[PDB]
Amino acid sequence: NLCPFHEVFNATRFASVYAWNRTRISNCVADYSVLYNFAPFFAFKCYGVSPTKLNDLCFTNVYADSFVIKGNEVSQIAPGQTGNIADYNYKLPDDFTGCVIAWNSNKLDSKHSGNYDYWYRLFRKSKLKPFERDISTEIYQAGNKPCKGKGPNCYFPLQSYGFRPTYGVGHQPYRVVVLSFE
Amino acid sequence: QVQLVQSGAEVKKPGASVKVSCKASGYPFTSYGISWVRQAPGQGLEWMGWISTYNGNTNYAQKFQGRVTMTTDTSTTTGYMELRRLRSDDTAVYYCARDYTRGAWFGESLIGGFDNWGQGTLVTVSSASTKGPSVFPLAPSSKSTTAALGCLVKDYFPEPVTVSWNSGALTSGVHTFPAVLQSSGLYSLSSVVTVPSSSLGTQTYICNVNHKPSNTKVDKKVEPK
Amino acid sequence: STIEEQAKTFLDKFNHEAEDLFYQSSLASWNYNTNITEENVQNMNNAGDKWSAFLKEQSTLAQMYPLQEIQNLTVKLQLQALQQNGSSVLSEDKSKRLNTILNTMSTIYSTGKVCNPDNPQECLLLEPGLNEIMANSLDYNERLWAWESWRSEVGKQLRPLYEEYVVLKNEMARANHYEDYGDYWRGDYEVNGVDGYDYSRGQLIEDVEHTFEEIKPLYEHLHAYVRAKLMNAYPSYISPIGCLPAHLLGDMWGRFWTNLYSLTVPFGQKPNIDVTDAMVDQAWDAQRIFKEAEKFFVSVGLPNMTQGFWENSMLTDPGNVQKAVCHPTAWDLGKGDFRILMCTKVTMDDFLTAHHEMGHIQYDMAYAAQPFLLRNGANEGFHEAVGEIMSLSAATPKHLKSIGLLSPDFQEDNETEINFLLKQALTIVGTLPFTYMLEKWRWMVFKGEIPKDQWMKKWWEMKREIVGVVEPVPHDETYCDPASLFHVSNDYSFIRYYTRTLYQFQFQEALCQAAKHEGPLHKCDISNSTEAGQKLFNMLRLGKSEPWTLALENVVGAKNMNVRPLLNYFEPLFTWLKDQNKNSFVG
Amino acid sequence: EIVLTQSPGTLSLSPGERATLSCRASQTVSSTSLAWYQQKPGQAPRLLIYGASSRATGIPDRFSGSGSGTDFTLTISRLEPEDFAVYYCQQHDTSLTFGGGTKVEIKRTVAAPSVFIFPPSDEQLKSGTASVVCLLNNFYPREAKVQWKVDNALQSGNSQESVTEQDSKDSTYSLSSTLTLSKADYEKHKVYACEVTHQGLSSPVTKSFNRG
Ligand SMILES: *[C@@H]1O[C@H](CO)[C@@H](O[C@@H]2O[C@H](CO)[C@@H](O[C@@H]3O[C@H](CO)[C@@H](O)[C@H](O[C@H]4O[C@H](CO)[C@@H](O)[C@H](O)[C@@H]4O)[C@@H]3O)[C@H](O)[C@H]2NC(C)=O)[C@H](O)[C@H]1NC(C)=O
Ligand SMILES: *[C@@H]1O[C@H](CO)[C@@H](O[C@@H]2O[C@H](CO)[C@@H](O[C@@H]3O[C@H](CO)[C@@H](O)[C@H](O)[C@@H]3O)[C@H](O)[C@H]2NC(C)=O)[C@H](O)[C@H]1NC(C)=O
Ligand SMILES: *[C@@H]1O[C@H](CO)[C@@H](O[C@@H]2O[C@H](CO)[C@@H](O[C@@H]3O[C@H](CO)[C@@H](O)[C@H](O)[C@@H]3O)[C@H](O)[C@H]2NC(C)=O)[C@H](O)[C@H]1NC(C)=O
Ligand SMILES: *[C@@H]1O[C@H](CO)[C@@H](O[C@@H]2O[C@H](CO)[C@@H](O)[C@H](O)[C@H]2NC(C)=O)[C@H](O)[C@H]1NC(C)=O
Ligand SMILES: *[C@@H]1O[C@H](CO)[C@@H](O)[C@H](O)[C@H]1NC(C)=O
Ligand SMILES: *[C@@H]1O[C@H](CO)[C@@H](O)[C@H](O)[C@H]1NC(C)=O
Ligand SMILES: *[C@@H]1O[C@H](CO)[C@@H](O)[C@H](O)[C@H]1NC(C)=O
Ligand SMILES: [Zn+2]
């Protein structure tokens, strides 16, 4: 009946960024006041609409995109933006209607011994189109002459985040939730 | 304004099955689940299971893998827990908290904990029968030993004895020990009072046992000798 | 295929894996420096061994790339910074002998206790034992004993071993299949692939020598002024033409000139701005000191510190069980992790060094957007320069009247200004004659240009032309040393300690001009000037992706390094030096 | 099936000190799945810390929590009289398990009992039963040892202990030692002794007397 926004914001485990999770919220009366009355969720930037006029739409497909990218990688979650995360990890269209509610989660997602549990692909020959999920799991390798293993010019694409608790705000695991009203 | 109406005590016997009531109020019913925790007398808390009222999903512990079932009422926002094959050690106080540890819709998990609790529910299970309290006096010794005196509520079932003294007159210096199960599988309780030395044989001390289940009210007068 | 593709990919994998492994190693070393335990010692040794093995493997993989086929400028700069050898084809036995000599020399210098004669059992350390005598004592006899013991107990033990080490350096530099091991050190200088911003190899020779030609006025004036002050201190170390040794610079080798200040005081009557008593009176602790530094940095438009800096950095020695080295270091662990390790107390010196480490952290935070190989100065020497300039700006009396730290009723005078300016001149600029003379003479020794048997003959003759040695006591020929030194003995690049001091004072006037400052440059506090902050941040943000030519030109307005701005910084002090050296005979 | 093994067992403190409780897991437990509770005597527990860091609704500032991986801690700064209750720890990283619990009692001065003794009632003998009960008045601390000696030797099986809670006013306990013997054994033996060794006492005080 009400909106399972706490089952996403107030959830325990998110997904890996290269294969980010995407939960579809529906049929709920979204009380945005729980997140709009004050500012506990850091950046609250809405692209195209206003926070005060959020009730004048229809909840056809509100795709609450849940993932952990980085502190200074939320800037690459803007419409018409390019970068390492935007080219091929998660691409947002130029004409994008939605909001970004990224909030810090340093204490929840960290490990003194090293939280090597969140992966992003680093090298790619091509680029990916918007409105396209990345759920397939092929295996790739580098160029020059065909090779095997981490040789002279051959590298493993998916490399892991450290996520030790004492990082800076720009590298701390900001749990980013992106709403795409469509 | 959180309210969690919970059912009353039970005096069931081994071999049967019972279901506990838990009425919650003051929150959107379908956005949260209901959990259950059982606590034996003089013991610690131990988990029983979790149920979501949205899609009807359940989650039980391995210790009670199959011995238990949970039902929910959506119209009255009431949760239920039913235990089967009652054993002798199944006597406990059952609590009904409000779930914020696992998501209702998604079911994955939530960062939280049981935030709002009920009142508790003592369910006593034993192989016995209703009995009247056989009150036995405890007068002070013949030698004038501040002394103590009382009346022994012995051989009574279950534990509904209300033993006042002089309709609550000498409450200054009253000790009422909790009931302890004897080796014969029957609770005996003791309640005693203390009197000064200079006023030993001057007053009248009657203990009013208001044991409602048997309606036995033997007000045995005890006076120091 | 396409060879142009397969070098930036190598650079990026290096930039991540490293960032992972370097963060691991930095965390281990940080824990050891904050928690000296055998378990953490073993863990940090394992981390350092893994880091060194990975770096050596990556260097072996990177030397494969020729420096010609790629045309992308940043890629070529990164590769040339990482295309070096060490002992790639040099024999295992010769490298093992090299390491044996190196470790033996380091042990003899530092670990080898300077056992006082007539008591071989009582073996006193060099530090802080003779450090006390050198930075503190003023007697001629004790210092003469210290110099004799140095040049005849470390000198004799270092002559043959380091002579064979210099021969090994001759052979390795010549067989390097390149110009020399000096090329190994200077490789980050050369820029190739773009016309108008390319850098040559021998261009540094001309840069250093011509800067010496134009500093020889300031060089000789400041050096002779220190000479005359030590003459007032040490009458029989300095004849009216007499020279100065190298162990009278506070530390052993002479990296910094700081400890000379007590003997070089221009105006000793008026005490300097010592805020220790003032900070005690207002009941302000170390955290308040760092908040003051943070506010100073905000005043010029630069961003202020993150909460992680306040939380994680160790701003006070724990004491009790915890044993920590009190060496200040702006520990840039990477991945946004900026910490400061220092045993901060209520002290003016702690205030200034907090500003310096804050400048280090600010520079690290400026280029955080670069890849790991580019998460450094555009060359090796930008970093300490950015660190020093902030303390220079913050130590001004005007800024301390600005923060309600001194009485506004009191007024400054030229006396305290000259005192402070000379104090900073000794501290910072003193490392340029060091680098130029000692390092380049050492390098031409490394190539083998100077004969072995004529070392001590050439050694004091350099002071016989610049300053004019007259010797009350003769010398021997079997004296040599410079290998002891930490960086020469632990495989670290060295030329950064020249570019640092040129660039910081070459940035100083460029920033103060944007601040609308009027009057002398020494008293210029850039506080309340967003223009100067923007001008500095224009270069600080570049990192190493762009050439250091563009990095310099982004502030100084010139594509090539010059020392004229440093000469104009000490313009008050330069005129004062010309007015004081009227009697000091400049040999 | 991670075991939490909450430690310590009990906690007696003074009105104004600092309170600290621990809950240590075997395997590694995520910090997002641990909570704390506070159970006043006779009432239900109430959440204090959720998520191992956050404070629940209506919880005063003196309550705090922390911990991650294998060790977790609850912290109370000021000890008001209402801050003496029962506490537990919970985890749901992998299945939901609780801790052993940690009672919080009130620390006071060492009180000594006023040991009594009572022969079985004559009306009790009119029901084919006898019972010798040994009584101890207000005493501190709770730890007290009691023994039953018949004639000269200890007995077994005929012992049912019962201890109340600390009093609201004086914060002292009350102990009831009960021995049950048939009237045949009651008249078979003559000398009855209640051997009590309380930490608040300095000797094995035995205040009992034989039939007469
Ligand atoms: C630097 O490294 C040293 C390495 O020794 C490290 O020392 C540690 O000190 C702490 C105490 O400050 C030790 O912690 C305790 O150790 C005992 C066993 O020796 C455990 O039983 C303790 O845990 C129990 O008790 C706790 C409450 O006191 C409970 O919360 C917990 O659940 C347990 O019941 C506790 O761990 C620690 O063992 C040593 N280290 C060792 C011996 O490995 C020091 O703290 C480090 N400090 C810094 C500044 O880095
Ligand atoms: C996830 O769970 C937390 C609770 O553990 C939610 O935060 C809490 O939300 C409630 C409202 O649902 C807040 O109550 C409000 O408190 C303010 C005073 O602080 C009061 O003025 C209001 O009238 C109301 O009572 C509560 O404070 C807040 N707690 C916080 C912010 O720490 C959170 O909304 C949940 N996130 C979701 C739904 O995604
Ligand atoms: C040489 O190597 C550099 C990388 O070191 C190559 O850089 C890339 O150049 C393109 C432009 O040609 C940059 O594109 C721009 O990126 C920004 C940020 O995403 C975007 O807003 C602009 O619209 C535009 O797409 C790109 O960022 C840059 N990449 C990096 C990492 O700097 C350069 O192309 C190479 N040159 C040759 C000839 O190979
Ligand atoms: C660091 O920068 C922050 C930027 O917000 C400063 O915060 C403001 O400081 C002023 C006083 O200087 C307060 O009046 C504002 O309310 C603060 N804003 C916020 C959001 O806290 C902070 O003071 C700076 N620290 C310094 C200058 O040392
Ligand atoms: C994402 O969460 C949903 C439940 O909301 C789950 O069904 C799905 O499997 C998850 N996928 C990932 C990528 O973890
Ligand atoms: C130095 O490295 C270059 C780069 O590959 C190589 O050509 C040369 O042979 C190496 N020389 C030595 C002495 O290792
Ligand atoms: C900087 O600006 C502040 C705010 O106007 C002022 O209080 C302070 O004195 C200024 N500092 C200077 C001019 O050094
Ligand atoms: Zn420095």
Side-chain angles (χ1 to χ4, degrees), chain A residues 20 89-91 127-134:
Chain A
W20 44 260
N89 283 147
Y90 187 39
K91 178 69 171 61
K127 310 185 88 74
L128 265 294
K129 295 158 50 54
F131 284 141
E132 186 179 3
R133 273 176 157 176
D134 194 15

Side-chain angles (χ1 to χ4, degrees), chain C residues 344-359:
Chain C
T344 307
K345 285 183 309 303
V346 177
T347 307
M348 180 64 195
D349 293 331
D350 273 13
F351 183 59
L352 296 188
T353 192
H355 279 280
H356 175 106
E357 301 299 317
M358 285 268 283

Side-chain angles (χ1 to χ4, degrees), chain A residues 25 42 47 68 76 88 97 103 108 122 128 134 141 146 166:
Chain A
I25 300 296
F42 194 53
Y47 287 122
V68 173
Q76 307 182 10
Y88 62 89
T97 305
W103 80 93
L108 324 175
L122 184 54
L128 265 294
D134 194 15
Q141 61 94 31
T166 76

